[PDB]
Amino acid sequence: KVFGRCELAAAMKRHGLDNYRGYSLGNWVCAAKFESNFNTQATNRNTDGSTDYGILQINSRWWCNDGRTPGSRNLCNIPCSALLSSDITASVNCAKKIVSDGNGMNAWVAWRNRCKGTDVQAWIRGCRL
């Protein structure tokens, strides 16, 4: 599924992302936008052979198994293809651990590059949250 901006905001709010680790809803929704343009089935391959899955583009070297990324941990106990679901629950819960890792939202490069230091709050305007 391709989410709307406020649809995803709301479905991220209800999953405990809003203000999680100090990061307002705006951020998360900004990141997804640039990570996957809100597309839940979005995949991208990396140069190191790993593959980013999901609305939040969770990388398989650490967080999920897709069984062709050799020497990878699976720190979210899930098949990577569970990150393509129209039910972002798995993506949420695994992001929540990624964002506790300690580098913060800096993990998602798109966010660090394109959302960090901006009016992230604009990404939740007009949305009945």
Swiss-Prot record:
Tissue and organ distribution: In the egg white and polymorphonuclear leukocytes.
Active site (record annotation): 35, 52
Annotated localization: Secreted
Keyword Disulfide bond: yes
Reaction equations catalysed: Hydrolysis of (1->4)-beta-linkages between N-acetylmuramic acid and N-acetyl-D-glucosamine residues in a peptidoglycan and between N-acetyl-D-glucosamine residues in chitodextrins
GO process annotations (BP): cell wall macromolecule catabolic process; defense response to bacterium; defense response to Gram-negative bacterium; defense response to Gram-positive bacterium; killing of cells of another organism
Positions of the C-type lysozyme domain: 1-129
Disulfide pattern: 6-127, 30-115, 64-80, 76-94
Pfam family, one: Lys
Enzyme Commission numbers on file: 3.2.1.17
Residues that hold substrate according to the record: 101
MF terms (GO), sorted A to Z: beta-N-acetylglucosaminidase activity; identical protein binding; lysozyme activity
Keywords: Allergen, Antimicrobial, Bacteriolytic enzyme, Disulfide bond, Glycosidase, Hydrolase, Secreted, Signal
Any GO CC annotation of this UniProt entry: endoplasmic reticulum
UniProt-listed SUPFAM superfamilies: Lysozyme-like (SSF53955)
Highest rank taxon of the organism: Eukaryota
Note: Lysozyme C is capable of both hydrolysis and transglycosylation; it also shows a slight esterase activity. It acts rapidly on both peptide-substituted and unsubstituted peptidoglycan, and slowly on chitin oligosaccharides.
Subunit: Monomer.
Annotated function: Lysozymes have primarily a bacteriolytic function; those in tissues and body fluids are associated with the monocyte-macrophage system and enhance the activity of immunoagents. Has bacteriolytic activity against M.luteus.
Name under which the protein is recorded: Lysozyme C
Natural source organism: Gallus gallus
Gene: LYZ
